[PDB]
Amino acid sequence: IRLPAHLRLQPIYWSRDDVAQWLKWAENEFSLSPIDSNTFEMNGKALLLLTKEDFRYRSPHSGDELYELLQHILKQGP
Ligand SMILES: [Cl-]
Structure with a gap:
């Protein structure tokens, strides 16, 4: 995935603008x-x-879809 840089953080630290x-x-x-x-x-x-x-x-x-995408992000490797 071509995830944006600032979003490479663990999602638990994402700001409210980051989620935007x-x-x-x-x-x-x-x-x-x-x-x-x-x-x-x-x-x-x-x-x-x-x-x-x-x-x-x-x-x-x-x-x-967003939900599952979020799960992929969280699940780095199976
Ligand atoms: Cl905030």
Whole structure:
């Protein structure tokens, strides 16, 4: 993945602006339906506490994909 540099940190340290940039990157990188940043106005800590369901309610169309992408990020190697 061509993850942005500042996002190479462990997601537990991502800021709220960092998560804003994360949604921008994914939508562009994976051609996802638009995502409002206001939808996911949170830090990395709070974002990691979300369920794929929660992502979907917040983003009905590209929500679950973001969840799984986040899991890939977290899962460096199987
Ligand atoms: Cl913050």
